[PDB]
Each structure stands twice: as structure tokens, then as C-alpha cells.
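re: that complex we talked abt at group meeting.

here r the seqs, copy pasted straight from the sheet so there may be weird spacing, ignore it
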Amino acid sequence: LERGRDYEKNKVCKEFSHLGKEDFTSLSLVLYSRKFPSGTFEQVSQLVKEVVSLTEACCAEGADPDCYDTRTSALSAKSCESNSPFPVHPLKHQPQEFPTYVEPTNDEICEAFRKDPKEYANQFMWEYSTNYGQAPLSLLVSYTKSYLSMVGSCCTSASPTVCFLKERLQLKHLSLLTTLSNRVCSQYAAYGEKKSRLSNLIKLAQKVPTADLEDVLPLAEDITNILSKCCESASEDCMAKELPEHTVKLCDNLSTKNSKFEDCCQEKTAMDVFVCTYFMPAAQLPELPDVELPTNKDVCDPGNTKVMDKYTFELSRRTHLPEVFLSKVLEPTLKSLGECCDVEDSTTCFNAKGPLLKKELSSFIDKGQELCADYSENTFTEYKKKLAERLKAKLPDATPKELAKLVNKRSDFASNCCSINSPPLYCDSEIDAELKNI
Amino acid sequence: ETTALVCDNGSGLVKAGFAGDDAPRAVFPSIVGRPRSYVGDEAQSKRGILTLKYPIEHGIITNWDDMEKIWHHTFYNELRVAPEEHPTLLTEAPLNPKANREKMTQIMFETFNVPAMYVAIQAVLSLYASGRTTGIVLDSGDGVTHNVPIYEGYALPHAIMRLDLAGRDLTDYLMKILTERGYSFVTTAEREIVRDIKEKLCYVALDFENEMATAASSSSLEKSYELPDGQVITIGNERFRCPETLFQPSFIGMESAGIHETTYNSIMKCDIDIRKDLYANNVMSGGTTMYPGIADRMQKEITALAPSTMKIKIIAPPERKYSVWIGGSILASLSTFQQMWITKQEYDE
Ligand SMILES: Nc1ncnc2c1ncn2[C@@H]1O[C@H](COP(=O)(O)OP(=O)(O)OP(=O)(O)O)[C@@H](O)[C@H]1O
Ligand SMILES: [Mg+2]
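got the structure back, here u go
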């Protein structure tokens, strides 16, 4: 059944009366900051002021039944004015891969809170929400509320430091759920379901390369299912229930596969385990022979998902390369290999496309391994030293100035795109540009 | 009783006390003296008629029989308590072997009969002492120095950096350079004298090179120190050349990176989205971070290595010498920590 004409209006009106103008304003501030990650505090606050204004008036028992329609329409028109007071999209708000929000020291927090409680609370909800806005709305509302409650009680406590430790430990579960859901949902948003599923399988393969496909494939699918369902859900506890539940399945499956997972699964709480497994770097890949692309048959025969997942798993667990690189070349490669099945002379298409893709893949991997050379096996300062020595030998001609410049650009690239959790959107475009230099 | 005990077993000093207190009640040298037996200060004062051994090296327990002697002394002689009556929180160095933790636990339950206990990571307790659960700790004591990045209580194991240079090496270096200046410090007694000079007169120069130039002439940096026999000596640039070794390990022939670089490298092993929270919560803990000027120098060095738009904040409280113990005191006192204790029941299981 299709929702009634006044679904939206009646939905908002209900939450306004149920929460109260103050709590409704807080809800709106979080909701719109989340919607416009790039909006300034001024812009978002003004928009929220208008929204709350029309909501209060248009929801009044006995108010113009058509009040909400126009007021909201005029609001959208007011956003048209170039350089309007409201924030705007270029619709779609890109995920924030580089949050800049920094929590002040306990002393700074309390001084600021004492000077202007209301301003402090609004500024916090705005800055936090615009930085971690991909986390489900319900988690953001709950987290900011609990955080502010902690600030209120601890700053006026007889022993602030003790109170802060106590409340931060109690806030831990929710803090992690909020921060982690923002990150995995940001990567899901950037990738889309199909690529997210591939990426997650790749990361599991690198973390536990000694496992069987049957141990990791269901885990990759479960996390993908949870993200497609819970990230943009309005449910008040989709993510809060699913994430922790995923952690139990992860440990039941991998707690004995290697020392690192055994240690992670010894953590006391579900979110403690998730954080440990999320931050876990790729393991040292065992040495194994090369893996050839799937045969013409295994590619064209109906129901090939398992064959492709297995290839993904086999290639990932033996190829020393970051996930952002593997995900980037693996999807076009498998897609192209499948373009052959649609032709009358499939075999002919395979004899010319098979060798071509095999070389394009080997090449990509080689250029990627060069771009990330020495990064994962050394401390950063030591890595930069070996880089300078490698580039010098490669460019005996370059001046000291030029070499220094190259070292800085390459090491900067590596510090951003050669790790297991490198940012997908940023690295996709950076890898393209950096590949043309080799 | 109902008061939990907190014991921070350091390479050089044992810090022990009761949960809830703002400072350790007992602080003594982690040494055991055999007749050629005593423990702590009494062993040091009688070192002439005994042989000294240090059960803890580089923060890791290496001699269990001697460690039991230190713990027994801590409970009965220093704290004057009966172990059987108090839950006990112990500390361990970052990356302490699992088998080590297991042995500590076994000894506490079977030898001392404690009713409950817990083993916490020293660096994490230093962070908790400041009422935070995320940040990077530079912990430098008498035998070892570590950088430990922590996110909501979880210390990232692959990002932990360890520098085999600490207080003891700084004392030996000050002895060396004071000797090159004309004085003579070689005996064990003279080593204790030098340690006192180090703790009282050394400091970290903001700009090492410039400070060296300033000392080359003026005496505005020189200070006097009265020896036991009353002789008054002068300490000049040795004041800041000593701790400079933390930033330049080459001063003692070590090829390793200095503490500003291990801090930076530690942060770089962490995901890009949480680095900002490490840079903004860099905690210093331990006796070897007590040098005046060290925080400002670290601020400067890290700023030069990090992105220009990164906020750098160094947290170095006046009581940081005991931050580990203090963090343990607060943690062990939390109502929500009472479920973390490993009970004797659960152990006999
Ligand atoms: N004010 C001070 N300035 C410089 N060094 C100091 C100062 N006070 C103490 N120290 C040095 O700190 C060391 C004692 O610190 P600490 O108690 O933190 O070490 P520890 O816990 O015993 O050992 P570790 O943690 O390395 O195992 C000694 O080398 C001591 O000389
Ligand atoms: Mg210590």
C-alpha cells in the first residue's frame, strides 16, 4: 500500500510533539549536519532554525492543513538563491574519508562547556555529525546525547578525571559502534554492494590466508548484508544488534585460524573484538604458485559466483598488494573476461582476450608492488630512507632537489593508499595518476 | 580487606599502594641482594656485603624466584598487608609474552593466595590516568622506552614501538661526559651521585645546537652541585647533552631512531582516520620523561614531521613519573571494573 499524501508531514509532526521543541531541534541539527557534511556551522544552524520554525507552526493542532506544504516548498526555493544561507550539494553527499574532528583535552572541554553550555553542545553535535555522518542516524543521536551527558556530569564532578574515565569506559560500546559504523558504511557507500562484497572477501583473505574459502566467504557476505541493510536504515537498532552479532560469527569461524585472530577473539566485548579485527593488517602471505584466470567454461557456465569468489580468494591470499589495488583491477578484469560469453565465437574471443587480460593484470600488480615497495615491512622513517636509496639508484641523474620532491610525493601516496584500510574514493583517483608515472 | 592493591613492577623501581589513593605508598628499587638476603633500599645500603640482582630487565620479569622475593617484600614489609585479603592489580610491559602473564597469575594465586587479580598494560594505565581512552603513550622508565597507540582502550600491537634506551643509559652517559670534563665518576657510589645530578639538574634544550653555542661562553646555564664530602662541582652543557640522547641515540653509539621518530612511526602504523586522535593526545609517562623542557621539545619535533594542518598536543602532567600506578589506582577503584577481576574461583577452573 502506498503511503498517504501527508506521510512526511504527519511523521515529523509526531516526532515534534513526542520529543519536544528542544529535543526536536537537537535531532534536526544532527540530521541536517549528517545530510550536509560540508555545510558550515552557520549554514546548518540557519537551516535547522527554519525547519524547526515551520514544523512548530505547521504541526499545531488546528493549524493550516496546507501550512507544511508551502513552508517546506519555499524552504527548498530559498536554497536555490546562489550563495544562500543554507548549505547545498553540488541529492548525494560523498562520504567523509578524512575526518578532521578532534576531541579537545578534558580541561579544554570543561572550560568551553562552562563558558557557553548551549553553544558548546550545538558546535559538538554539528562538528561530530558532519565528520561521522555515515553512521546510522539513531546511533549519532544516541552517541551525541550520551557524550554531552558525560560532559555535563564529569566537568562539575568533585573528581573530573575519575568521572571521565568511568564514563568513557561506559560510553565505549556506543562510541565504537558509532565510529566503526561510520567507517564501514562510508566504504560501503563508496563501493556499492557488489564491490563492497568483493573488497570484504579480499581483506579477510589477506588477514587469514591460511583459511579455506568456506571459512571466510560467508563472513564477507554477512558483513555486506548487514551494511546494505543497516547503514541507511531508520530502524532504531539495526546496526546496534547486527554488528555485535557478526563478531560472534567471525570468532566462531576464525578464532583458531592463526594467533592474531586468537588474540582478537580473547577481547572481552563484541566491539573490542570488532575493533581488533578491523585494524588488523594483512598477514605475511605464504609463498604459493601463480593462479591463472578462470577457464572459458567456468566463466560462461551458468552459476559461476562460487568460481569467481574462489579465484578472488586464491589471488588475494598470495598476492602482496593492498586491497584498494586488488579491488580496483579485479572488478574490470572479471567483467571483461565475461564479455566474451555473449559472442557467437566465444572461443575466438577468449584466445585474444585471455592473454591480453593476463598481461594487463600481471602488469598492474607489478606497478602496484613498486608503488608500495618497502612500505609495509618498515617503520615510516626507515621506509623513506630505503625509498630515497631506491630512487637514487633508479635516477642517478636527478638532482638532490628533484629526488627529495619525488620521495615526498611517493611516501605521501604510500601513507594513504598502501594499507589494508586505505580510503577507496581517494585512492581510486590517486592510483590512476600514480600508475601513469611508472 | 576490601581495598584493592596496585603494584607497578618496574625495571628500576617498584611502585606499590592502594586503589583509590592519589600516589603510591611505597616506592623502592626492584633489586634483591644475596649474601655473596635483602630487597629494596636495604639491599642497596648493604650492597657491600651482598650481590645485587634485578629480576626485571627492560620491563620483563626474568627471574621468578627473585620476583617472588620482591612481591613478598612489597606485601609484608612495605605495605604491611596480608595478600589473601586484597584483590591485586599488577602491571606488565607492552608486548609482554603470554607465558609471562600466565606465570605472574599462577604465582599470585598459588603462592600469595590473592582472592582476585588483574594484569594491565602499563602504557594503557598511563593514558587512563589522564581520563582518556584514546591516544599514544610515550612511556620511558629506567630500562626501556615504548610508544603505544591506544584506541578506546585497545593497544594496537603492530604499531607499538620499543626503544632499548632509558634512564639507566642516560645515567651511564652523564657519568661518561662528566668524566671527560675532568671529574671522576666510576664507583657504584659515584653512579648514584650521577643519577642524582641527572634527576636534579638536567633538562631538554628546545634547540640543541643553539644551546651548545650559548653555553660555549656565558655561565647562565651552569649550576653547582654539592657532593657528599661537600666539594661543590659545576655542571655545564652536560645538563642538556645528557637527555639529548633520547632524541639522538647516536650519542651513545646506538643506530636507532630517537623518541620523536618512534612516536611518529608508531602513529604512521595506524589507520589514517585515527592518526589525528593520537597526535592530539600524546601522553608522556615515566621517570625518564621528567626532564624540564621535554614536552616543548617533543611538540617541536613532532610538528616538523607531521602534516602542517595537524593539531599536536603533548600531555605531560607534573605527576607523570607515577602515571602508570595512578591509572591503576583509578581503574581498580571503578565500580564497573569489579567485574574484570579474575577471581580465585575462576582460576581454579
Ligand atoms: N626528575 C627526573 N629527571 C630525569 N630522570 C628521572 C627523574 N626522576 C626519575 N628519573 C629516572 O627514571 C628512572 C625511574 O623511572 P620509572 O620508575 O618510570 O622506571 P621503571 O618503571 O622502574 O622502569 P621501566 O618502566 O623501564 O621498566 C630512573 O632511571 C631515574 O633516574
Ligand atoms: Mg615503568
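couple things i noticed - Chain A has five domains: 7-92, 105-192, 193-280, 296-372, 379-438. Residues B 10-13, 59, 141-144, 166-168, 195, 198-199, 286-288, 290-291, 321 surround adenosine-5'-triphosphate (ligand 1) (CB under 6 Å).
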